[PDB]
Amino acid sequence: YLSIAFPENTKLDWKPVTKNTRYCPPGLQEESFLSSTPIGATPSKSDGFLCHAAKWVTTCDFRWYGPKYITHSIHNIKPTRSDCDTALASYKSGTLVSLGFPPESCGYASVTDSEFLVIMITPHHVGVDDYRGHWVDPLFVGGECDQSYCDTIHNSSVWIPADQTKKNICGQSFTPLTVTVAYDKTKEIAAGGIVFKSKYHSHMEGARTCRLSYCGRNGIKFPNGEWVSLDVKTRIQEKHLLPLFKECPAGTEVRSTLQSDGAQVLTSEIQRILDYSLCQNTWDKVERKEPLSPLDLSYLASKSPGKGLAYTVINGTLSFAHTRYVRMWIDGPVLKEPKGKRESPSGISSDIWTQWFKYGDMEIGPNGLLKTAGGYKFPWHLIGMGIVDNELHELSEANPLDHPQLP
Amino acid sequence: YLSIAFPENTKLDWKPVTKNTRYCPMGGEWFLEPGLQEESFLSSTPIGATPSKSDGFLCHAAKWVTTCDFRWYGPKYITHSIHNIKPTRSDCDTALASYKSGTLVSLGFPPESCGYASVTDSEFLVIMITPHHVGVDDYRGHWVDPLFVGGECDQSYCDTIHNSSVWIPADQTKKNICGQSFTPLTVTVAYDKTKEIAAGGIVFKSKYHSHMEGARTCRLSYCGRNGIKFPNGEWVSLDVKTRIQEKHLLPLFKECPAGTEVRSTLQSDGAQVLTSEIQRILDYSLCQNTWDKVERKEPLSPLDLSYLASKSPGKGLAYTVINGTLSFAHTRYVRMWIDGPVLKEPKGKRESPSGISSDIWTQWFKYGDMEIGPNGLLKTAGGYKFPWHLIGMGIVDNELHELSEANPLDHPQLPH
Amino acid sequence: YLSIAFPENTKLDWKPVTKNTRYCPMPGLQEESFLSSTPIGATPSKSDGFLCHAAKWVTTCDFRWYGPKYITHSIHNIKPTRSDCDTALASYKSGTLVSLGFPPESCGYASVTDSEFLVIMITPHHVGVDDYRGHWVDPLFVGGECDQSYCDTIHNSSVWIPADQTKKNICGQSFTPLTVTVAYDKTKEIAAGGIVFKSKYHSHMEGARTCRLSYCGRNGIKFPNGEWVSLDVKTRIQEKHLLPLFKECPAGTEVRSTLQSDGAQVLTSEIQRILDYSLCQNTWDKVERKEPLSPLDLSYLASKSPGKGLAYTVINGTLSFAHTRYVRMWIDGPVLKEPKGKRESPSGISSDIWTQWFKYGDMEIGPNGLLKTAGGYKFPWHLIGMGIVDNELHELSEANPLDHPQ
Ligand SMILES: *[C@@H]1O[C@H](CO)[C@@H](O[C@@H]2O[C@H](CO)[C@@H](O)[C@H](O)[C@H]2NC(C)=O)[C@H](O)[C@H]1NC(C)=O
Ligand SMILES: *[C@@H]1O[C@H](CO[C@@H]2O[C@@H](C)[C@@H](O)[C@@H](O)[C@@H]2O)[C@@H](O)[C@H](O)[C@H]1NC(C)=O
Ligand SMILES: *[C@@H]1O[C@H](CO)[C@@H](O)[C@H](O)[C@H]1NC(C)=O
Ligand SMILES: *[C@@H]1O[C@H](CO)[C@@H](O)[C@H](O)[C@H]1NC(C)=O
């Protein structure tokens, strides 16, 4: 149930650390552009009206002789744009009226009739598909529509959205945002070498960002599902930025970004800070010729996934290694066998480390990992910064998702 | 106005530190790890009230009769009346479903139906659907309105005081009548594998919940589904099927008192789970940073000693220095409210900021020329001073609490 | 594009330290708290209302000398009385409102007489709110606005009524309780400058940039970051009225709401100051051991926030301090090729940051471990890192949504 970063390999090529070497975790370039991210669905946008037209007829049938035969019927007809709009704005003003049936217009030797045009406005809220950029309600033709004048199944009723003006069918309302782009000044701009930043995003990977069209504008979906508005005009390294990214798979869904996101960015920034002054605190200790504890060794290593360094103590000689860090899941802080599930917390138990050195009376692996008669014990700083890394993740995918409506 | 966590007694039984184990407080529930076991269950927590859910309609039935009176002779005597009746279920379902489609129409009064030597009349059945939004009582599980019979109702076909009106909720399908919307959540359960499972030996964790005590958790039924209320007012749904250690879980917990209310779980909650973990960590290395000093035979400062001690309420350790021997003591920590960082008398308000300033400590040892109490508290000629780490970290522990009860509460409506 | 806390002057008068005093950034302060209320965000159900339209539906019976019964139907749009609408309003709320249509016919001889029904129409109509100027806003209103529960419209026969007539001064957004603490010098006369505002959502708000603002009908104070709390003239601090100590806010000033997401700031700042202190003490300890200081060891010692503090260096092996006021500067990167930073604003004014350089290892060293090496001018990593946090804490303070009126 624990998460950790561990060198992927079970053996490393160790090399003694040279005197007065002090490496605790370039040609950077940052460009910022103006952007827009969604706050959450506001249903006030998918409000609408059911426009219903019918003719209320009073026919006066008058033949050879006899009384005045008078009838009342109702003809459901489909209204025109001007028929609805007129009766609509009267609804907006409280002047909408149902006048009822006509007075009698009677005559001789012909069956003729006089009719009234009565338009009905009933308020009606619908659903939205923000991705597919059109409205959705079962009363619609097919269950969806992308027009300002939507046809319904009933021959005589059409639907009008609360606001006829705005030309994009969208559920969520948005907020502006300044998204930063960090890349290598030296190499060609490429989707891979880019890390995205903002005040709500610490280190969002360009390698795993994909182009997604959302609420009628192109934009890009971050690794955790959050999305920013982005058009083909915004250039990075004087090259168009938008095209660099593959398109997102079908049924890819987007999350809203709350103010609650900044809370991660802060604690990541501190964990890096706490961590850094903590490995120095371990080098100061080395420098003083004070022997290193398994706790001390865990201070020195990288603790996040990616190419990094590991350290150990081989016959009093501080040794290090290059290696790539990946995320593993250990069963607890002390294992009976040095095994971890390398690809999923229900994955298989493979050996994580097998190369064991001498350490007094017990043995010691990479970054302060122990092999003791009491089992294989980890360092607590590693476990702990893994518990943070965990919470730090789940909080990123903790936002509300935009689920479209299905016709 | 300042708080710290402090040993409950004013005196402790001190014992010298004997064996060299760097016995540091490892923030969170890692204290009892000689057999901790975690099982997680899938669950649901409230987001906050959504008013859309209490939308509804007032169904009004009426008979519009056109009477044709025709006696011995004379003109066609016609009168118009309207007879208000209570609608039937299918009547409402129809006139409502006519409304959702804009098909509902008021035909008005009937055409004239006349005859001889008898007064006969013709009627229309006119139903009106006028929109009416009501309030909800989520704990007790029913609607609430002044127009209701008794001031509340718990069915999808509610009667009103006026005999000719009934109330229907916008969505007739959903049986639980609940005001706020939910989101899913995965709650972890931690327990000692050795002991019998019980509410006492259980700690609840999630991504919004750092260490919730099972002993201070109680069963509360909410919005038509069983569940448990954590101390901070937040609530997670838990039904009786869920087993921990092959035993029913929900039953382990007592029922929450009447008029106990629940807070929503906003996402802003993670920030507590995060900065709690950071302090649990920082305090660890700081405790070590001092054990290293102990290692090196460097004399310990009053700050050094607060580094060694527990800083959260509950059974922990205290350290002091008895004539050059670093000594520890067992004690349970409580939260106190000191007036400031440096006091004129060793007195603090235990368990409440509006409490009795009582003496916090009385067992004072010699410390160069001044005296020193537990976990680096000094008795000096300048007054009684705390260490600043303890003070600052009480400031954190505080807003962690103060932020824990910071979510909105589900206040039901009280009828009539 | 980076921000840091750096001493304002380019050179200071340093005095060697021999005091054995551990002056780390953590007198006669006194704290008094008052109870208050702040906006959480706009609620749209709060702006709901109704259209009352009164009209007379007349049935006239014209009957002259002779001939058939001539009957006509008309509708006269009329303006309703306050008490007339209320009749149809609670009648609307009960589903009992009815458009009865045209009256039965009342006919007679040698005179034209008519029978009429008073049909009131209630059309639901959602409107806008101006929380600042404290009145509703709509184009249908006379002039486009109104401040009463019975509002006139452009159309002579329509008035607008809000769902709840019991108006608290008509406010679009809803509020919450909050406990605001005031920190001041007990010693000095109380003044707008000497006050710092705290709460569980506000860590150290400067009272000097706070200004009195009236909002949704409650007098109050607008914090520097746009957030606002309700505050009355009754609340006294140091036995003096608090609300009046503060200037009035500029015209068209708008407020942002205060979310729980704020607590996230107040938290990391409390951890920072906890870490810094523990790290700087952790340095004094090093000096106790007479281990030479690294520029890092030195950056642990300095103030990290704008204001009167201390800066440090090491002059000919002697650890030295100086008094100075800290400001926020914007350096181009973590190591510059010229000792230049932009003082008081990120837009322009590239000034020399430091000029007083002492000998160090083989290289020269400025304040708080700033190095002048052949590779450029390197800042410590801690100082840079703490400037990155101190920054986002800023962009996150202003990260809440603000109230735009119509
Ligand atoms: C650390 O200690 C081992 C055990 O002493 C070292 O192994 C060497 O083994 C060779 C071959 O028998 C001998 O020269 C000595 O026994 C050891 N050499 C020295 C210089 O002491 C080796 O240095 C280290 N082992 C590992 C795995 O790093
Ligand atoms: C200093 O403290 C001593 C503590 O009492 C005991 O004596 C020592 C030698 C150990 O046996 C220890 O475990 C005991 O607690 C006092 O005996 C001594 O008198 C004190 N000296 C002073 C006050 O000058
Ligand atoms: C209200 O309800 C009844 C129908 O049950 C209706 O006939 C009458 O108007 C009212 N009841 C009585 C007792 O008058
Ligand atoms: C309001 O009333 C009359 C008719 O009721 C309308 O024609 C006009 O807009 C207003 N009155 C005047 C005198 O302009």
Residue numbers in the entry:
A (entry chain A): 1 to 25, 34 to 415
B (entry chain B): 1 to 416
C (entry chain C): 1 to 26, 34 to 413
Tell me what the authors wrote about this structure, in their words.
In this work, we have characterized the fusion and biochemical properties of CHAV-G and compared them to those of VSV-G. We also determined the structure of a soluble form of CHAV-G ectodomain (CHAV-Gth, generated by thermolysin limited-proteolysis of recombinant VSV particles in which the G gene was replaced by that of CHAV) in the POST conformation at 3.6 Å resolution. In these experiments, we could obtain CHAV-Gth crystals at pH 4.6 and determine the structure of the protein at 3.6 Å resolution by molecular replacement. The single trimer in the asymmetric unit has the three protomers in a classic post-fusion conformation. The three chains were built from residues 1 to 415, 1 to 416 and 1 to 413, for chains A, B and C, respectively; with internal breaks in segments 26–33 and 27–33 of chain A and C. Those breaks reflect the intrinsic flexibility of segment R1. The overall structure of CHAV-Gth is very similar to that of VSVIND-Gth in its post-fusion form. The PHDs are more divergent than FDs and CDs. Only 79 residues of the PHD (called PHD core) out of 90 in CHAV-G are in structurally equivalent positions with VSV-G. The largest differences are confined to helices D and E which are missing in CHAV-G (see the orange arrow on Fig. 3B). A comparison of the sequence of both proteins at these positions reveals that CHAV-G bears an insertion of 4 aa residues at the level of helix E resulting instead in the formation of a small two stranded β-sheet. For CHAV-G, the amino-terminal part of R2 adopts a β-strand conformation, which is followed by a small loop and a small helix; CHAV-G R3 has a structure which is similar to VSV-G R2, a long loop ending in a β-strand.
Chandipura virus (CHAV, belonging to vesiculovirus genus), is an emerging pathogen associated with deadly encephalitis, principally among children, in India. CHAV single envelope glycoprotein G is involved in two successive steps of virus entry: receptor recognition that allows endocytosis of the virion and fusion of viral and cellular membranes that allows release of the viral nucleocapsid into the cytoplasm for the subsequent steps of infection. As for other rhabdovirus, fusion is triggered at low pH and catalyzed by a conformational change of G from its pre-fusion toward its post-fusion conformation. G ectodomain folds into three distinct structural domains.
